[PDB]
CSV table of C-alpha atoms and ligand atoms in Angstrom, one decimal:
chain,number,residue,atom,x,y,z
A,1,UNK,CA,-5.1,-23.4,-38.7
A,2,UNK,CA,-7.2,-26.0,-36.9
A,3,UNK,CA,-10.5,-27.6,-36.2
A,4,UNK,CA,-11.8,-28.7,-32.9
A,5,UNK,CA,-15.1,-29.8,-31.4
A,6,UNK,CA,-15.7,-29.0,-27.7
A,7,UNK,CA,-18.4,-29.7,-25.1
A,8,UNK,CA,-19.9,-26.3,-24.5
A,9,UNK,CA,-19.0,-24.4,-21.3
A,10,UNK,CA,-21.8,-24.5,-18.7
A,11,UNK,CA,-23.6,-21.4,-17.6
A,12,UNK,CA,-21.9,-19.8,-14.5
A,13,UNK,CA,-25.2,-20.2,-12.7
A,14,UNK,CA,-24.4,-24.0,-12.5
A,15,UNK,CA,-21.1,-23.3,-10.9
A,16,UNK,CA,-21.3,-22.7,-7.1
A,17,UNK,CA,-19.1,-20.3,-5.2
A,18,UNK,CA,-17.7,-21.3,-1.8
A,19,UNK,CA,-19.5,-19.2,0.8
A,20,UNK,CA,-17.4,-16.8,3.0
A,21,UNK,CA,-14.2,-17.7,1.1
A,22,UNK,CA,-11.1,-17.2,3.2
A,23,UNK,CA,-8.2,-16.1,1.0
A,24,UNK,CA,-5.6,-16.5,3.7
A,25,UNK,CA,-6.7,-20.1,4.5
A,26,UNK,CA,-6.6,-21.2,0.9
A,27,UNK,CA,-2.8,-20.5,0.7
A,28,UNK,CA,0.0,-23.0,0.5
A,29,UNK,CA,0.4,-26.2,-1.5
A,30,UNK,CA,-2.4,-28.2,-3.2
A,31,UNK,CA,-2.0,-31.5,-5.2
A,32,UNK,CA,-4.1,-31.9,-8.3
A,33,UNK,CA,-5.9,-35.1,-7.4
A,34,UNK,CA,-8.6,-34.9,-10.1
A,35,UNK,CA,-9.2,-33.1,-13.4
A,36,UNK,CA,-12.3,-32.8,-15.5
A,37,UNK,CA,-13.0,-30.7,-18.6
A,38,UNK,CA,-13.8,-30.3,-22.2
A,39,UNK,CA,-10.1,-30.7,-23.1
A,40,UNK,CA,-9.5,-33.5,-20.6
A,41,UNK,CA,-9.5,-37.0,-22.1
A,42,UNK,CA,-8.9,-40.2,-20.2
A,43,UNK,CA,-5.9,-42.0,-22.0
A,44,UNK,CA,-4.8,-45.4,-20.8
A,45,UNK,CA,-1.6,-44.6,-22.9
A,46,UNK,CA,0.7,-42.1,-21.0
A,47,UNK,CA,-1.5,-41.4,-17.9
A,48,UNK,CA,-1.6,-37.9,-16.5
A,49,UNK,CA,1.0,-37.4,-13.7
A,50,UNK,CA,0.0,-35.5,-10.6
A,51,UNK,CA,1.3,-32.0,-10.2
A,52,UNK,CA,1.1,-29.5,-7.4
A,53,UNK,CA,0.1,-25.9,-7.2
A,54,UNK,CA,1.1,-23.3,-4.6
A,55,UNK,CA,-1.0,-20.3,-3.8
A,56,UNK,CA,0.7,-17.3,-2.1
A,57,UNK,CA,-1.4,-14.4,-1.0
A,58,UNK,CA,0.2,-11.1,-1.8
A,59,UNK,CA,0.0,-7.8,-0.1
A,60,UNK,CA,-2.6,-6.5,-2.6
A,61,UNK,CA,-4.7,-9.7,-2.1
A,62,UNK,CA,-3.9,-11.2,-5.5
A,63,UNK,CA,-2.4,-14.7,-5.5
A,64,UNK,CA,1.0,-15.6,-6.9
A,65,UNK,CA,0.2,-19.1,-8.2
A,66,UNK,CA,3.0,-21.6,-9.0
A,67,UNK,CA,2.4,-25.0,-10.5
A,68,UNK,CA,5.2,-27.6,-10.4
A,69,UNK,CA,5.2,-30.4,-13.0
A,70,UNK,CA,7.5,-33.3,-13.7
A,71,UNK,CA,8.2,-33.3,-17.4
A,72,UNK,CA,11.0,-34.7,-19.4
A,73,UNK,CA,12.9,-35.8,-16.3
A,74,UNK,CA,12.9,-32.2,-14.8
A,75,UNK,CA,10.8,-30.0,-12.6
A,76,UNK,CA,8.9,-27.4,-14.7
A,77,UNK,CA,7.5,-24.4,-12.9
A,78,UNK,CA,4.5,-22.3,-14.3
A,79,UNK,CA,4.0,-19.0,-12.4
A,80,UNK,CA,1.0,-16.7,-12.9
A,81,UNK,CA,-1.2,-14.2,-11.0
A,82,UNK,CA,-4.9,-14.6,-9.9
A,83,UNK,CA,-6.5,-11.2,-9.4
A,84,UNK,CA,-9.6,-10.9,-7.2
A,85,UNK,CA,-12.8,-10.8,-9.3
A,86,UNK,CA,-16.4,-10.0,-8.8
A,87,UNK,CA,-16.9,-11.8,-5.5
A,88,UNK,CA,-14.8,-13.5,-2.9
A,89,UNK,CA,-13.4,-16.8,-4.2
A,90,UNK,CA,-13.6,-15.6,-7.8
A,91,UNK,CA,-10.5,-14.4,-9.8
A,92,UNK,CA,-9.3,-13.6,-13.2
A,93,UNK,CA,-5.8,-14.1,-14.7
A,94,UNK,CA,-3.4,-11.2,-14.3
A,95,UNK,CA,-1.7,-9.7,-17.3
A,96,UNK,CA,-4.0,-11.4,-19.9
A,97,UNK,CA,-2.3,-9.3,-22.6
A,98,UNK,CA,0.9,-11.2,-22.2
A,99,UNK,CA,-0.7,-14.5,-23.3
A,100,UNK,CA,-1.2,-14.6,-27.1
A,101,UNK,CA,-4.7,-15.4,-28.2
A,102,UNK,CA,-6.1,-15.3,-24.6
A,103,UNK,CA,-9.2,-13.1,-24.2
A,104,UNK,CA,-10.6,-14.2,-20.9
A,105,UNK,CA,-9.7,-16.4,-17.9
A,106,UNK,CA,-11.9,-17.0,-15.0
A,107,UNK,CA,-11.4,-18.9,-11.7
A,108,UNK,CA,-14.1,-19.8,-9.3
A,109,UNK,CA,-13.5,-21.7,-6.0
A,110,UNK,CA,-16.6,-24.0,-5.8
A,111,UNK,CA,-16.0,-25.6,-2.5
A,112,UNK,CA,-13.2,-26.2,0.0
A,113,UNK,CA,-12.5,-27.0,3.6
A,114,UNK,CA,-9.1,-25.4,3.3
A,115,UNK,CA,-7.1,-28.1,5.1
A,116,UNK,CA,-8.0,-31.2,3.0
A,117,UNK,CA,-9.7,-30.5,-0.3
A,118,UNK,CA,-11.0,-28.0,-2.8
A,119,UNK,CA,-12.8,-27.9,-6.1
A,120,UNK,CA,-12.1,-25.0,-8.4
A,121,UNK,CA,-13.7,-24.2,-11.8
A,122,UNK,CA,-11.7,-22.5,-14.6
A,123,UNK,CA,-12.9,-21.1,-17.9
A,124,UNK,CA,-10.7,-19.7,-20.6
A,125,UNK,CA,-11.3,-18.3,-24.0
A,126,UNK,CA,-8.2,-18.8,-26.3
A,127,UNK,CA,-8.2,-18.2,-30.0
A,128,UNK,CA,-11.9,-17.8,-29.6
A,129,UNK,CA,-12.3,-21.4,-28.2
A,130,UNK,CA,-13.9,-21.8,-24.8
A,131,UNK,CA,-12.2,-24.3,-22.5
A,132,UNK,CA,-13.4,-25.2,-19.1
A,133,UNK,CA,-12.2,-27.5,-16.3
A,134,UNK,CA,-12.7,-28.4,-12.8
A,135,UNK,CA,-9.7,-29.2,-10.7
A,136,UNK,CA,-10.0,-31.3,-7.5
A,137,UNK,CA,-7.2,-30.3,-5.1
A,138,UNK,CA,-6.1,-32.2,-2.1
A,139,UNK,CA,-3.7,-31.1,0.6
A,140,UNK,CA,-2.4,-34.7,0.3
A,141,UNK,CA,-2.0,-36.9,-2.8
A,142,UNK,CA,-4.9,-39.1,-1.9
A,143,UNK,CA,-8.6,-38.3,-1.2
A,144,UNK,CA,-11.5,-40.4,-0.1
A,145,UNK,CA,-13.9,-42.2,-2.5
A,146,UNK,CA,-16.6,-39.9,-1.1
A,147,UNK,CA,-14.8,-36.8,-2.3
A,148,UNK,CA,-13.9,-38.3,-5.6
A,149,UNK,CA,-17.6,-39.3,-6.1
A,150,UNK,CA,-18.7,-35.8,-5.3
A,151,UNK,CA,-16.2,-34.5,-7.9
A,152,UNK,CA,-17.4,-36.9,-10.5
A,153,UNK,CA,-21.1,-35.9,-9.7
A,154,UNK,CA,-20.2,-32.2,-10.0
A,155,UNK,CA,-18.4,-32.7,-13.3
A,156,UNK,CA,-21.3,-34.6,-14.8
A,157,UNK,CA,-23.6,-31.8,-13.7
A,158,UNK,CA,-21.6,-29.5,-16.0
A,159,UNK,CA,-22.0,-31.8,-19.0
A,160,UNK,CA,-18.9,-33.9,-18.7
A,161,UNK,CA,-19.0,-37.6,-19.3
A,162,UNK,CA,-16.8,-40.0,-17.4
A,163,UNK,CA,-14.1,-40.2,-20.1
A,164,UNK,CA,-13.4,-36.4,-19.6
A,165,UNK,CA,-12.5,-37.0,-16.0
A,166,UNK,CA,-9.1,-38.2,-14.9
A,167,UNK,CA,-7.3,-38.8,-11.6
A,168,UNK,CA,-3.6,-38.0,-12.1
A,169,UNK,CA,-1.2,-40.7,-10.8
A,170,UNK,CA,0.7,-39.7,-7.6
A,171,UNK,CA,4.4,-39.2,-8.1
A,172,UNK,CA,7.2,-38.2,-5.8
A,173,UNK,CA,9.4,-36.2,-8.2
A,174,UNK,CA,9.2,-32.4,-7.9
A,175,UNK,CA,6.0,-32.1,-6.0
A,176,UNK,CA,7.1,-33.3,-2.6
A,177,UNK,CA,9.4,-30.3,-2.1
B,201,LIG,O1,-8.9,-27.3,-20.5
B,201,LIG,C1,-8.1,-27.0,-19.7
B,201,LIG,N1,-7.1,-27.8,-19.3
B,201,LIG,C2,-7.0,-29.1,-19.8
B,201,LIG,C3,-5.9,-29.3,-20.8
B,201,LIG,C4,-4.6,-28.7,-20.3
B,201,LIG,N2,-3.6,-28.8,-21.4
B,201,LIG,C5,-2.7,-29.9,-21.4
B,201,LIG,C6,-1.7,-29.7,-20.2
B,201,LIG,C7,-0.5,-28.8,-20.5
B,201,LIG,C8,0.4,-28.7,-19.3
B,201,LIG,N3,-0.1,-27.7,-18.4
B,201,LIG,C9,0.2,-26.3,-18.7
B,201,LIG,C10,1.4,-25.8,-17.9
B,201,LIG,C11,1.9,-24.4,-18.4
B,201,LIG,N4,0.8,-23.5,-18.6
B,201,LIG,C12,0.8,-22.4,-19.3
B,201,LIG,O2,1.8,-21.9,-19.7
B,201,LIG,C13,-0.5,-21.6,-19.5
B,201,LIG,C14,-0.3,-20.3,-19.9
B,201,LIG,C15,-1.5,-19.5,-20.1
B,201,LIG,C16,-2.7,-20.0,-19.9
B,201,LIG,C17,-2.9,-21.4,-19.5
B,201,LIG,O3,-4.0,-21.9,-19.3
B,201,LIG,N5,-1.7,-22.2,-19.3
B,201,LIG,O4,-1.9,-23.5,-18.9
B,201,LIG,C18,-0.8,-28.0,-17.3
B,201,LIG,O5,-1.0,-29.2,-17.1
B,201,LIG,C19,-1.3,-27.0,-16.4
B,201,LIG,C20,-0.9,-27.0,-15.1
B,201,LIG,C21,-1.4,-26.1,-14.2
B,201,LIG,C22,-2.4,-25.2,-14.6
B,201,LIG,C23,-2.9,-25.2,-15.9
B,201,LIG,O6,-3.7,-24.4,-16.3
B,201,LIG,N6,-2.3,-26.1,-16.8
B,201,LIG,O7,-2.8,-26.2,-18.1
B,201,LIG,C24,-3.5,-27.8,-22.3
B,201,LIG,O8,-2.6,-27.8,-23.2
B,201,LIG,C25,-4.5,-26.7,-22.4
B,201,LIG,C26,-5.4,-26.7,-23.4
B,201,LIG,C27,-6.4,-25.8,-23.5
B,201,LIG,C28,-6.5,-24.7,-22.5
B,201,LIG,C29,-5.6,-24.7,-21.5
B,201,LIG,O9,-5.6,-23.7,-20.7
B,201,LIG,N7,-4.5,-25.7,-21.4
B,201,LIG,O10,-3.6,-25.6,-20.3
B,201,LIG,C30,-8.1,-25.6,-19.1
B,201,LIG,C31,-9.3,-25.0,-19.1
B,201,LIG,C32,-9.5,-23.7,-18.5
B,201,LIG,C33,-8.3,-23.1,-18.0
B,201,LIG,C34,-7.1,-23.7,-18.1
B,201,LIG,O11,-6.1,-23.1,-17.6
B,201,LIG,N8,-6.9,-25.0,-18.6
B,201,LIG,O12,-5.6,-25.6,-18.6
B,202,LIG,CL1,-3.7,-25.8,-10.9
B,203,LIG,SM1,-4.1,-24.2,-18.7
């Protein structure tokens, strides 16, 4: 039982796809340097900590995707599969049936230069609620003001105000491995 009110997901036509996406070059570790979405809310109290996400390309060209978070004084590891979707750089979540309430989960790589930064769009329908976010990934924990301004501009183009954009605080626990 619940009530919630969400900013509507944008149409996919507003979400670019990285041209000539290179699945091998996207592999390895990325830090989550920025997050924006309709369930992201900037909170001065308990600021969001940076986490890292590792993409490994499998034989069948799916990704094993592992996020590492520091929570309650320990490293917490979330492992899932991204299955290639309708075009290069687009994916859906593998094994959707295994996640209660989940009916769709879409990933689109918007832009990346592979060796410094990426922006990736996610849309999920869970218990019939449509959540979306944009993740700004960096190969390092810092990115330029330019890249952050680009991220903010892109987020706003998808109907997100500034208070639904956060920049997780760099940490050293867990994510330096
Ligand atoms: O709105 C979104 N995110 C902002 C709020 C995140 N959050 C607060 C943080 C929670 C902490 N965890 C989750 C870590 C564990 N994860 C999961 O066992 C998981 C299983 C199945 C689907 C799924 O999505 N998750 O996360 C992250 O920090 C984390 C890290 C890396 C990737 C990732 O996805 N998450 O969440 C939520 O509780 C939340 C609310 C609504 C939808 C949703 O998916 N999540 O995770 C969102 C929109 C569209 C796709 C999507 O995956 N997300 O998370
Ligand atoms: Cl992630
Ligand atoms: Sm999630």
